Amino acid sequence: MTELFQELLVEDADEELGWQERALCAQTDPESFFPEKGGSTREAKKVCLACEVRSECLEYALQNDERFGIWGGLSERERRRLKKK
DNA sequence: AGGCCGCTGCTGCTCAAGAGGGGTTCGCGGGACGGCATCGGCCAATTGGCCCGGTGTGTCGCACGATCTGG
Ligand code: SF4
């Protein structure tokens, strides 16, 4: 349908700062990614599943070692066990 | 001979080598002190699963059956 022939051939920016700009969650409620009280961690996991820079997000999160929120489709203890493994 | 009334020339301002003695800085270190930063547990708390148990209302999968248009 309205796919623009996979981004088409009309582009003038020819400039990218980094993989932040390709983040899908930026098009989405930030609050849902930090479940307070008990919360849930599956809808935002589904959102991350379709992210095109999931690997980069996971790598950056692990390298900087944030212990809050859900990054790369994984929550805190998945990151912790991956770090410990 | 002094005072004074003019002339007349001149000048000036402006537009284009050690040596000693003493208080102070800072500069390294140098370590001591106190403090805040990091890591096993840990249980019973909101959301959200995950279902029983009743019908109904309303979509969908297909049976009998009538009307109508084309073949
Ligand atoms: S993987 Fe990272 S960048 Fe992608 S949507 Fe999830 S949190 Fe955002």
Residue A5 dihedral angles phi and psi, to the nearest 5°: 55, 45
Residue of A41, A49, A54, A78 with the most ligand 1 atoms within 8 Å of its CB, for mutation? A54
What experimental approach yielded this model? cryo-EM
Distance CA A79, CA A41 (A): 14
Copy the structure tokens of residue A10: 């009309």
Please tell me whether any atom of strand B lies within 7 Å of the Cβ of A46.
no
Distance A10 CA to B40 C1' (A): 57
Whether A3 CB is under 7 Å from strand B: no
Pair A72, A44: CB distance under 8 Å:
no
For A44, the 3-state DSSP assignment is helix
Atom of ligand 1 nearest to the CA of A54: 1
d(CA A16, CA A4): 20
The rounded distance, in Å, linking the Cα atoms of A80 and A84 is 6
Amino acid found at A11: E
* Whole-angstrom Cα Rg for chain A: 15
- Name every residue whose Cβ is closer than 8 Å to that of residue A50 and which is 6 or more positions away in sequence: A24
CA quadruple A66, A68, A40, A79: dihedral sign: positive
